[PDB]
Symmetry: C2
Subunit: 213 residues, 2 copies
Amino acid sequence: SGRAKAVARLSDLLSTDPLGRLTEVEELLRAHAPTAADFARLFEACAERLTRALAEDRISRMQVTLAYSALQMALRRIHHLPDPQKSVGAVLVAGVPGHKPILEAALAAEMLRAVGWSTSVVHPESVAALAARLKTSRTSTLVVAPSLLEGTEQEADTLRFVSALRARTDLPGLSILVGGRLAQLPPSKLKDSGADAGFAHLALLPAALARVA
Amino acid sequence: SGRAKAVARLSDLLSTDPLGRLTEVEELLRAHAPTAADFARLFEACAERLTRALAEDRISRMQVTLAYSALQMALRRIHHLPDPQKSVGAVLVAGVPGHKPILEAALAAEMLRAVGWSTSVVHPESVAALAARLKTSRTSTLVVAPSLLEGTEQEADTLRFVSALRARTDLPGLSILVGGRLAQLPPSKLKDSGADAGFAHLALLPAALARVA
């Protein structure tokens, strides 16, 4: 299928010269990712390899950082849908304060716009700043975008963030969806945390979003 | 002037929600920065504003990081010229190790490609890595890209980088251009570091390069 091959080749470019060979990175991505869901699947496969390479000291934090930025520029180059004319609903896609899931959040938005959600991305300074946004925009669904390559969220940190949001009394019937490592928790222990649904991988977000909203 | 208001509006967008309002950022940039040189001049004016605001604790370093990333994505959406197959010359645009002028290096490449130079971007790990690169590709002109949104410490790092680079015995024929605050140095101080000429502002790089061929 040249799926594993795409991953290998792209992983290699990202590890050696992501910003110098950006054009080749993009060619590979637009050839193997017609949709943002395909991009996301490709990204997570590559992130597994870079993460392993970092763990084995075959690359540096700086190299992962350069690859991450390269991927962001590649994504906007390839995928950039406007809001749907008439949406199926309003979704807010947000990172955990102190973290910056830039690619993941933008990948999330592109998937949900692709099937008719009016989406907005937010990188909030704090819980209080996010809550203020929620009310003001009267949004009913919040997707917490996981950081999957660098500046990852410790499980207890996303949980605390979700809890803090719930702890407030100015959020009625809000749908919270969480990703990354939290989505590996049992359904029981998840609703206990305040999340209504987990999505184990980015591409699984649209299916998860339909089941709850 | 028009550019005045555009700088103010872009700076405000970047200071508040650059990643959530990425479309507006792009739209502003398409209307006010139709060439990469215009983009550079616009980024440079905003960087000054963001630097001041950061120094005054009116914004966080996190905010600046998000602004910078949004500008990377916008830039790749709008300007992405192919490398001239028949070029007027071969220029290497490099970042300084320990720094990541991702946007400035990309801007430099766009501006040079726009006037017919074959250009490559590299973010090298070290002096040795760039040196080897300079050899294998027989580069005759090196442009060191400044980080307009990093602090004054980069000056020393750049002087040291360029000095160590010039000190090497395996790079004949090489012109070196530096930018940012270093291009405000007196000519003799500039030459002493190993550099040959400066570009005081990003937009002036094409003309600076012409002078040293």
